[PDB]
Design a protein around this ligand. Structure first.
Ligand SMILES: [Zn+2]
Ligand SMILES: [Zn+2]
Ligand SMILES: [Zn+2]
Ligand SMILES: [Zn+2]
Lengths: 247, 256
């Protein structure tokens, strides 16, 4: 019901973001100008607000501060720095919060031809370009067997040294970055995802997807959910050992 | 008589076999993954490629990552890695690809990188440019970026662990602190993104000819440069740094 609406919002967001991603000039000789991404961000937000005004009068809308009632939170493009360079790891993130708790989430990555979604009590799913498949986190129980995806080293000299130690301990390390690390945890394809500095707009949809897939997502101090300023997602089995190594 | 057309047809056949094997995987896992089904798929694709090239190019040598072969540094030599990214393949991560190249006189002249679970293919031929297609839409011609300052550059690598062996770990981490953006898309994908101009630097400290030959012609035809860490041009140097060409000498200098 809210999930069906969230998936329809993602359909509309994808139509707008696809066109703007395709229209970019990717020739570049310096740091990229984020103006076309900001422009796309504004167009998606406007469309989302217009639809929710029609279909959910009296739901609040937050676009990338007080959490009350039913509130939709949208990050039209997560991975803006990828979007602007022509790297297709970017997605719209759409969540419904009830009293600040993600209850519906959609992660829509049109240039990866992929979507992930979840709703409380109804499981998590992914599609590639194409029937949905139900998601489940892995059963990897030992850190030395685990696969980890992060974003970069620079955001982490104590916590940096500890993070690098975790990367030396696990079986496999990659940095697919942003939302994609967390979505791969939910699919069971990766075991650990971590980012040291990340906002509620970037975590809300991922929180419900990971939880419905059987995993855990907490801040670095182990507090559940998307509000803690940092995010560690695991299959749940590895969670305590990861927080211990990082703390 | 078109070697590029044959290479793209080998990729079509490889993709039909790898799609089936990727789709059939048991993804339940509770330890390090059992590579056996991936090793089997890897070997089956190589065998099929060898059988086709035996039929369509009977004098040509074929050097494969799974069955080996002699190298000729002078004749025509096909070099294939049927599945690059097998540790992704086995876990259900779709970053994996068949890499197919022809060398003439030691130099990659045709290359195809085929990633069916990313719905993507990259290819190039000497003098004829580099191209990519996404979900079999029309090809687009590739061009590396024009980023000239390291501090504005985007870098993609694989992992940190392989850097200690040549003694470069501290230097590599220093490069990651210098550039504008760091990711690790890993394997062939870092280099393909350099060719598209979406990333500026790709680096790996240990890479075989099978893993570099197709990437070498794609990067070159896109306007970039791919060398070993010690500056040897091409896929035979044992390590690989690919850039947009502008950043090349500064990257090699920072890494040593
Ligand atoms: Zn964001
Ligand atoms: Zn982000
Ligand atoms: Zn292989
Ligand atoms: Zn390989």
């Amino acid at each position: 019901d809210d999930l069906m609406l969230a998936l329809a919002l993602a359909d509309r967001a994808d139509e707008l973001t696809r066109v703007r991603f395709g229209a970019l000039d990717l020739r570049i000789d310096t740091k990229p100008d984020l103006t076309p991404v900001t422009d796309a961000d504004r167009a998606v937000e406007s469309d989302v607000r217009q639809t929710l005004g029609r279909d959910r009068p009296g739901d609040g809308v937050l676009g990338e501060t007080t959490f009350t009632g039913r509130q939709w939170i949208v990050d039209p493009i997560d991975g803006t720095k990828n979007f602007v360079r022509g790297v297709p790891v970017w997605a719209s993130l759409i969540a419904l919060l009830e009293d600040g708790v993600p209850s519906v989430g959609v992660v829509s990555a049109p240039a990866l031809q992929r979507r992930w979604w979840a709703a409380r009590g109804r499981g998590a799913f992914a599609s590639v370009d194409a029937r949905p498949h139900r998601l489940s986190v892995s059963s990897v129980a030992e850190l030395h067997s685990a696969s980890l995806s992060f974003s970069s080293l620079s955001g982490w000299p104590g916590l940096r040294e500890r993070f690098i130690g975790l990367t030396d301990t696990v079986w496999r390390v990659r940095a697919y970055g942003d939302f994609l690390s967390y979505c791969l945890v939910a699919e069971g394809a990766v075991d650990i995802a971590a980012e040291p500095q990340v906002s509620v707009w970037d975590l809300a949809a991922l929180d419900i997807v990971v939880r419905e897939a059987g995993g855990r997502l907490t801040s670095l101090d182990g507090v559940a959910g998307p509000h803690g300023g940092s995010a560690v997602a695991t299959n749940g089995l590895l969670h305590d050992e990861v927080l211990t190594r990082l703390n």
